[PDB]
Every structure is written in C-alpha cells, then in structure tokens.
Design an enzyme around this catalytic site. Structure first.
Site, mmCIF file in Angstrom:
data_model
loop_
_atom_site.group_PDB
_atom_site.id
_atom_site.type_symbol
_atom_site.label_atom_id
_atom_site.label_comp_id
_atom_site.label_asym_id
_atom_site.label_seq_id
_atom_site.Cartn_x
_atom_site.Cartn_y
_atom_site.Cartn_z
ATOM 1 N N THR A 1 34.288 34.108 46.594
ATOM 2 C CA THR A 1 33.724 33.503 47.461
ATOM 3 C C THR A 1 32.235 33.236 47.922
ATOM 4 O O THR A 1 31.683 32.391 48.322
ATOM 5 C CB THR A 1 34.317 34.149 49.139
ATOM 6 O OG1 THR A 1 35.744 33.961 49.034
ATOM 7 C CG2 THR A 1 33.783 33.288 50.402
ATOM 8 N N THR A 2 31.548 34.555 47.775
ATOM 9 C CA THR A 2 30.163 34.629 48.031
ATOM 10 C C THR A 2 29.405 33.670 46.848
ATOM 11 O O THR A 2 28.328 33.237 46.948
ATOM 12 C CB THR A 2 29.616 36.120 47.707
ATOM 13 O OG1 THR A 2 30.428 36.910 48.723
ATOM 14 C CG2 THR A 2 28.373 36.157 47.955
ATOM 15 N N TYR B 1 42.847 38.772 44.563
ATOM 16 C CA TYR B 1 41.874 38.527 45.168
ATOM 17 C C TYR B 1 42.686 37.998 46.756
ATOM 18 O O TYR B 1 43.100 36.801 46.784
ATOM 19 C CB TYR B 1 40.915 37.633 44.831
ATOM 20 C CG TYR B 1 39.603 37.334 46.099
ATOM 21 C CD1 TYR B 1 38.593 36.150 46.082
ATOM 22 C CD2 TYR B 1 39.566 38.171 47.197
ATOM 23 C CE1 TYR B 1 37.750 36.111 46.825
ATOM 24 C CE2 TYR B 1 38.555 37.988 48.016
ATOM 25 C CZ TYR B 1 37.668 36.737 47.703
ATOM 26 O OH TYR B 1 36.570 36.611 48.546
ATOM 27 N N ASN B 2 42.912 39.149 47.252
ATOM 28 C CA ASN B 2 43.753 38.765 48.849
ATOM 29 C C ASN B 2 42.599 38.513 49.820
ATOM 30 O O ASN B 2 41.795 39.583 50.190
ATOM 31 C CB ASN B 2 44.404 39.961 49.048
ATOM 32 C CG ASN B 2 45.445 39.465 50.105
ATOM 33 O OD1 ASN B 2 46.086 38.734 50.089
ATOM 34 N ND2 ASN B 2 45.476 40.383 51.569
ATOM 35 N N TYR B 3 42.720 37.387 50.605
ATOM 36 C CA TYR B 3 41.650 37.031 51.515
ATOM 37 C C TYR B 3 42.587 35.976 52.485
ATOM 38 O O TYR B 3 42.341 34.948 52.420
ATOM 39 C CB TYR B 3 40.633 36.438 50.853
ATOM 40 C CG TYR B 3 39.386 36.343 51.864
ATOM 41 C CD1 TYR B 3 38.108 35.565 51.517
ATOM 42 C CD2 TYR B 3 39.434 36.351 53.196
ATOM 43 C CE1 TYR B 3 36.981 35.523 52.284
ATOM 44 C CE2 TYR B 3 38.074 36.385 54.162
ATOM 45 C CZ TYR B 3 37.136 35.724 53.453
ATOM 46 O OH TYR B 3 35.907 35.781 54.310
ATOM 47 N N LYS C 1 41.428 43.111 45.364
ATOM 48 C CA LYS C 1 40.438 43.095 46.157
ATOM 49 C C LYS C 1 40.857 42.583 47.440
ATOM 50 O O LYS C 1 41.480 41.405 47.563
ATOM 51 C CB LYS C 1 38.967 42.284 45.765
ATOM 52 C CG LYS C 1 38.134 41.975 46.790
ATOM 53 C CD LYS C 1 37.162 40.970 46.306
ATOM 54 C CE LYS C 1 36.105 40.440 47.385
ATOM 55 N NZ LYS C 1 35.459 39.118 46.659
ATOM 56 N N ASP C 2 40.856 43.501 48.590
ATOM 57 C CA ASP C 2 41.517 43.020 49.806
ATOM 58 C C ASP C 2 40.397 42.893 50.882
ATOM 59 O O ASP C 2 39.373 43.841 51.120
ATOM 60 C CB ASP C 2 42.212 44.191 50.154
ATOM 61 C CG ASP C 2 43.095 43.737 51.359
ATOM 62 O OD1 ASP C 2 43.755 44.779 51.642
ATOM 63 O OD2 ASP C 2 43.672 42.580 51.564
ATOM 64 N N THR C 3 40.231 41.624 51.184
ATOM 65 C CA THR C 3 39.306 41.154 52.309
ATOM 66 C C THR C 3 40.043 40.902 53.626
ATOM 67 O O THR C 3 40.769 39.715 53.620
ATOM 68 C CB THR C 3 38.313 39.716 51.714
ATOM 69 O OG1 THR C 3 37.635 40.338 50.711
ATOM 70 C CG2 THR C 3 37.365 39.421 52.808
#
Lengths: 293, 293, 293, 293
Positions: B42-43, B129-131, B154-156
């Site tokens: 995302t970044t 990548y969990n968002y 990676k959990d956002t």
C-alpha cells in the site's frame, strides 16, 4: 425513468475480451428496450480491465449503439484523462468514474480534485458512479454539489434517502439507483431510473417493473420486483458477478463466455444448482407472459 | 522480530517510477538496519502500478538487496501469475499478495482459489497481505490455515487479537503487524515484527523501539513508541500516503519525488503545516541521539 | 498488572439477586488471587439491574471484600448520581460508568457532561468503562483527557492501539483491557491488567497467564492464553453471558443460579454440548496443575 | 398509508413526566390529523423510563385518544410481560417492543424467544420496532417471519430494501418506516406509513406530504419532503432528541418541558443556532399556507 444496463464484459477462454459476444449481447439489450448501456462498470469488471481494454469495450459496443455511458476511472489519473479525451470521437451519452478505490481515508480535497480533473478534460457530460462499499468512500450529494460538474449520478447504496439527496441538493441532476431491488421504488418516487446489473439477463423484467410503476400499478410492479429480487438472491449464492454469466445464458439463450479470474466462472455443478434455484421463477415469468415458453 | 519497510515508490514529475531515487532510499533503509523491504505494498502505491511497473520496482530494489518481499497481487490473476513466475529469476525472500480488492461479496471459495493459484505457481515462499479496510475482505487465521501455503502474514487491522490468532492457528507462520503504533507491543508479545510505513522516514526510531522492547525496557520502548505515534498522527492530517514523501525528505534528507494522482502531493502550505507539527519531535530525536543532525 | 473480575450476578428462580450465592462466588475469586471485583458490569448484567439492585449487589459483595469498583451508570442521570453518593459509606476502590447507551449520535458535549457530573458528585475515584459495541459510543483517550477526572479506564475493544492511547495521552491513568484474549499481551506491553469475564470461571488461568507474562515467559504465557481463548470461543457458541453461568458451575463447582431473561439460561442439551467443548481443556489444565480435579 | 407520531415525553423540573403538557401535545397531534401515537419509543425516551413511567405515559395519552401503540420492551422480561398484561384494560391499537438492547452478540434463538414470549402474553396485536443502530441487532424480514406473530413492524434503518423485504416475506404485515425523510417515498411505493419523529413538531407537513404523494403529485410531494428534510437535518446538529423539544415549542407554540439527562436540553446558544437554521423554512411554510402562524 430509464433502465440502464451495466453491460457484462464477455471474455474468451484465454482471457481476452470477446468482442463478437459483447456486440450480440448489446444488440439484444437495446432490442428489449434497455435505454442506455453503462460500459466498464462493476458488472462489466471495469476495475479488472486495463485502460486499453476499457477503450476496446467502448469501440465494440459503439458498433451497436451510441447510447453509451463510458466508465473510465482508475488509480492512474493520467490513464483516466487519456480515456476521457479519447472519447471525443464517439457520439455517446457521457463518461463516468467511480471514486478512487482501495486506499482508505483519502481526503475530500483529493477526491474532489480527482473528479474536477476529469470534468475539466471531458468532451462529454460526466456521471458520478457512487459505490461506497466497493470504493471505500462516499461522494454524497454535498460533495457532488461541490464538485459541481456532474450531469448525473448512479448511486449504488441501499439507503434511498442518500439517493434522494442528490436530487434535493442538485435539482438539475439525473439521479439513478444502482439497485436492482429498487426499480419499482425508484420509478414510483420521482427519480430517474436504475442502472441494474440484472437487466443483463432479465431486461424484459426490469423494463416491465419500470412500466408498471409508471402506470401507478404499484402492487403489480412490486409482485414483479419481488420475483426479480429472488433471482438477485439466487445469483449471490456462488457470487453474483460470476453468476450473471450463467443467468444471461439461461434466460437469454446466448453465452457470454467467461468472467476474468479472480471472478472465477461457476463450475458445472454450481451452474446446475443455480438453474435449479431460478427454474421456478422462470416458470412464473412465462405464466406472467414476460418470458416466452 | 523484524522491522520491514513497505517501501515508497518515488514518481518523477512526469509520473514514471524514479529508479534512481528508489535505489538511494533502499540503500539508506538497509544501512539503517531495516530487515527486509516489502515492494509494491500500500505504502508503495501497489494498486496504482501496472504489472510492468510492479516489475520495474522489483528490479530497481533488487539492484540494492536480495532482502525483498515482492507484492504481485491484482484483479487480473493472469498478470499476478506472470509476475509470480518472473520472480524465479530473483533471489528474494518471498512474493506476497493482498486479497482481490474492490468487488464486494466475493465468496470464500473464490478467495481461497485466488491464493492457492498463486501458491501453485510461486517459485518463492508466499506471504499473505491481509488488509480488510482496503480490500473489503478478511483472510483470517482460519482461512489462512485452509489456504495452507503461507510462509507468513502481514495483518493490517485494528484488532491485535486477530493478528495473534494467526500464531494460535498456524504456529510455524511468521506473523507481522502492519502498524507503526504496535512496534513495542509486537516485540513484547511474541510476534515476528512490523511492516511499518513510518520506517520509510524514521527507520532509526522503528529499529530502536524494537531493540528497547526486546531488551525488556518496556517503559523506554513505550516512551519512544508514543513519540513515533505523534509523527504517524501528523502524517494523517493531509493524507498519510502523500505525507510519507514529505516526511522522508524531512528526516532522511533526500527527495522521493511525487506520489501518483489521485494520491496527490502535498501543496506548499500543507508541507509547511506538516513540518510544523513534527519539527519539535525532530529536535527531541536529535537531542536523544537517535537521529544524527 | 492486575486481573479484575466483572462479577456475575446470580439470580434466583424468581428473578431476584441471590445474595448468598454472590458472596460465595466473590469469596472464591478473591481467595484465588483476583485483585478487584467490578460490580454491575456487562458480565454482571448491570444494564438489566434497577438502581436498587445495583446497590444490593454492592452490599452483598462488600460483605466479602472492599476490593470493589462499583458500576453505577444508566439512562437516568439522577439515579446514577444517587448511587454515586450512596457509595460514600463503603470503603471501596472506586465507582465506574459506561457511556449512556441505546441513543445513537449523542454529542461529545453531552457525553462529557454526563461523565463530569458523576465525577463532581463522586466520593471515590472514578473509572471510565468504555465499550463502544455495547453503548454505541467511544469515549477515547482524547475525550477521556477532556473529561479529566478519571483514575482509570477499562477499554473493551479489540484494538489495542486505542487502549495504549489512554496511557499515551493520560500518563497517570490506570489502563485496563476488557479482553480475556489479551491478558498475556497487556501484561507484556506495559498496561495495567485486564477486566476479564472469563476470570469468573477460570480465575486460576487468568492469574497464571498474567504471572507468566510478568516473568517474561512469553511463550508459556501465550500457550496458556491460547487455551483460555478456546474456552472463550466455546462460551460464545450459545451466548457468552448465559454460558458464563454454566462454565462457573463446571470449573469452580458451585452454581450461580440463573441469568435474567432476555439473557436466557442455557438448556440441558446446550449445557451438555458446551461441557463437551471444554472438557478436553479442563483435562489439560489439570495435567498442567493449574486446576485440581 | 398512515402518519404515526412517536410522541415526545415531557419532563418536569423535578424529572417526572409532565402529564398535563403530554395531554396538550397528544390532543394537538390528533387534531392536526396524526393517525396514531407510538408511546415510549425512542423519541419518547422509552429506554430512559422505568416500567412504572412507561405505564404512566400510556395512561396520560389514553385520556386523550385510544389510537396508541404502547412500547413496553426492556432488559427485564418480567417487567415487559407485566406491561403487556396491564395493557388489557386499554382499548388500544397494539403493543410494541424493540429488541433487547446494549448486549452484543445475543443469539437468534434468545432474540426469537424474547419476542415470542411477549406475543404469548399480549392482549393486543404486537409490533416489532426494529432499530439496529440503537439496539445493536437486526430483526430482519426472515427473523420476523420466524417469530411469526407480529401484526406490524417499524423499521428504523438506512436501507429501504430491508424495509421492503418485510412486505415481500410477510405480505399481511403492516410495514412502516421510522424515517421522516421517506414519507413521500413510502406512500409512493406501497408501504403502510411512517412513524416519524418530526411529526411531533410539524404534523401539518408530514400529513400534507403523505396526501400529495397519495394524490400522485410526486414532484409537489418531494418539494415539501425536501423542506421537511432540511428541518430534520437542522434538528440533528445538536442532537435530535433534545432539539425535538425546541422545535415543538417553535412550530406548535406550546412547550414540552425538559428532556431527561443524559439527553440534556439545548443551551441558549444552541437554540439560537437551531432557530437560525429553520426560521426561513418556517416562513416558507407560512407562505404555502401549511402553517397558520
């Protein structure tokens, strides 16, 4: 009011747009009384299409009709501007964009700038496609008035108070709902119609709900609306965007090829199960003289 | 535990990837102790990059380091598969994908099939990548276990219980938080680290918080964490994805160009106001010898 | 850090508070190492209790211990003031209130006024009980700071960033999580402990997780936390507030009578199925010497 | 369709129900063509009233009219049953309940058992008051059908599809919207009416909207509906439940005393701002001969 179809994009077995199947489907829709076609919308998997593919869709459909609203939005504003300018050579109804998707907590100032940029370059009237669940943001009646350049809005939201507010704050704006389940209500309450995914596979149902509501036969319109609701509910069992392909083939008699993965095609068993769920509705529609045996 | 930077993609004035600035930034991050770089996250405006651009990013960073997790996901699974296969030529840590975004009401089966398809073609370990807020869906510890092929997550999310559950249900999985504000806590509670957007601009702070927490100096770690939180909050005033560019220049002393519209750059007055909010924190970090002046 | 039990209110068959059963329970909790008792909280069905019953609870528990936080809030501010004043004759830890519930969209101004009013009449330290899902509002670290009279906060939310912010903005405040699933994490990360519904039925387990984490034995603490998590999950199958009664009888060996409908008691079959879900866990806890047979 | 007022409860300076003001208000509403009065609803601060006070409201209003639906719900089912039974001596329209509030994650079985219990003891038709934002749970068309004993439903929700679904799945149920903003739409689309808080202060407008819509003067109906909407929006600025008192005084000329804290009355500055927002509308309505003075 109008029924507008957010036309499905047929893909081939190797994941290219099937232009010939797309033209057959567009032709059938117009012949069944659909007013306009909304190209590269959610139902057409717009966010899954490259800018070149979005343009390929416009060219294919334009071969059949000029009654097109061309959706062009995306996360590269340069690509969306290029599509907007390219539409100059096409004598269509307008262009449209949904809000920038994915990114959470985008500022109102940035959302406004995105839309005003499109308006400044557009050779045609611009339509707002508002879809808060899909995009994560709401371009409501107040924000639309600030932006100040929309000819119309398609509002995909279950809250008809929000849709009515566009008309309240923007009296000259064409205001459509993106709900299939609100065809009768939208027609009855003074709004401009519906951009209805289900009109891909039952255009005769959607147009008839609208006609009945306009004649103030609200009970008869609702009886039909409620049948259509059941088909929408059945399409959601395995995923509506995938199911829409199966349902078009079932009700209309031609196929639209494949969706694009990760909108995966239904397998044979799921297609059998879905047809089982809508068989009874088809029989009721034949008895109502809406569909031919 | 690790600090992983979801690296910013610098864009030129003409909206192309600035490969040279990206290399200068990646070098600096590695030199300052960042463990690994997550590319096209995302970044890094991953969703705004074409498949070709996602590869260009990988190539630029790979000139600097092997310590890369390559994000490849999107709404054309053929393109994501092609990127996964092309990664075979790169000696990197893993590939990653977020869930298919935009489309609401995607079935669990289709979500699982998307991820399993990538796992089947991947020449490297695969990271989830969990968002949920960005993608509209949740691939929780259960779904992750059913998918069965993830090396790490990676959990956002605003829910550390959810993040801990990946460890509970998948004991061998590397479990990272996507939050800058949880560096002290992650290190203190047995998780594997943070993929932290704020490490683009204050890698020294993020690595120091983690060190302090691993030394069991939790009060000291919190004091530093709480300072970092204030920078994160300041970045959100005008939009964090835009603000991250300004902050990296301010704290690290090189330029990262522009974001890609509709992630618009900060204007002069926004930049002035942002720097005003963080200048006192900068002075304090320099007085603390965390930043060199 | 501390474990605080939001003590269950036992009711008789005719829907009165069973004061004698409540005293048994309170004595057992204290003897098993619970630090304080939170009376008339959610687990105690506080919103279902008249002001007179809220006082009956305090009187019964005060016969056993003075280690009490007395919850007094409701939708009749005159009643909450009366209870607050009445507490002057009890040498307890403090009083507490949740935010006014039910009514959506109450102004920050009105919320702040509600809490400042209780603080102005309170003969004891005042604790904020923040539970946004239940009350519909969030009295966050900022609003808590503006109210400016809280000694502590119990934050029932899965977002630990939110809980940490109370400590960041109010460094003198005691900050507790309302989660059973966060005991290891809270203890590890510098917070003040947990107000834990599950400590009603497994006080031994909650106290032990806290102890292990304090001793920096994070893996052992997490292994036990994860076992406790499975009990919390089992309690949710048929409804946690109802299931807590069944679980207390099962693990502690005395009953707590009935809940108050519409928090309906589990039926015999439901009780049997719940026991089947937790009997294997009880066996492990015995083999770990955490519980006796 | 009908217009039903969820009547405001006036309180005295000593926080008791002001029966005389209540009677003057009820008389005025009936005189101005309101169909029925919904007593102890949200607008009447029902959750803030003891069972004794709920009964006291019924008795005061019953002195004026029998066109009452008597809301009786709360978190002590025995009290709700008592109120249901006591209603036998009153020749009214029905009783009603909202769902048990505050407690999250109540099982469908327990919610169903709550409502069926009230139906079993009710001497009058029973109405579901569905307000998910306030109560924290949804009793949708399917759960209503399962309960199987409701004569009607008041649906307060931002989702007219959800309201229409009660009609679709329960064709002989009375289906009302809880929104002031949907009076024109409800009448147009075949629903049974509106339980409209704004009808406390502008009963003339609500009745006229309904009439215009019924006459199929949809544009004229919407014009007037959109003016009413501006009054509703103004009322929300400082909190609608408090503002409703000020607006009743302003438009109908008599006062309704005070609300019950923590529903605090507007202060002078807030009252001035509120009036400034609505005095233009008041002037417009006088010009249209909808209001006399």
């Amino acid at each position: 009011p109008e029924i507008i179809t957010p036309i499905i994009t047929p893909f081939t077995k190797d994941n290219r747009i099937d232009k010939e199947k797309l033209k057959i489907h567009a032709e059938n829709l117009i012949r069944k009384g659909i007013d306009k076609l909304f190209v590269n919308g959610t139902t057409g998997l717009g966010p899954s299409l490259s800018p070149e593919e979005k343009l390929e869709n416009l060219k294919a459909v334009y071969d059949v009709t000029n009654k097109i609203i061309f959706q062009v939005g995306g996360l590269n504003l340069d690509d969306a501007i290029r599509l907007a300018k390219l539409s100059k050579d096409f004598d269509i109804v307008g262009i449209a964009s949904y809000a920038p998707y994915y990114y959470p907590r985008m500022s109102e100032k940035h959302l406004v700038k995105y839309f005003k940029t499109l308006c400044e370059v557009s050779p045609h009237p611009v339509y707002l496609y508002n879809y808060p669940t899909a995009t994560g943001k709401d371009i409501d009646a107040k924000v639309a008035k600030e932006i100040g350049c929309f000819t119309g809005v398609k509002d995909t939201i279950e809250n008809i108070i929000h849709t009515l507010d566009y008309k309240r704050l923007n009296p000259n704006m064409l205001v459509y709902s993106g709900s299939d389940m609100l065809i009768a209500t939208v027609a009855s309450t003074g709004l401009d119609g519906n951009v209805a995914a289900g009109s891909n596979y039952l255009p005769e149902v959607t147009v008839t709900i609208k006609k009945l509501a306009m004649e103030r036969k609200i009970d008869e319109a609702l009886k039909l609306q409620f049948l259509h609701d059941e088909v929408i509910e059945a399409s959601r069992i395995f995923g509506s965007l995938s199911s829409n392909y199966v349902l078009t083939k079932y009700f209309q008699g031609y196929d639209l090829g494949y969706p694009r993965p990760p909108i995966f095609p239904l397998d044979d068993e799921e297609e059998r199960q879905l047809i089982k769920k809508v068989e009874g509705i088809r029989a009721k529609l034949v008895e109502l003289k809406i569909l031919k045996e």
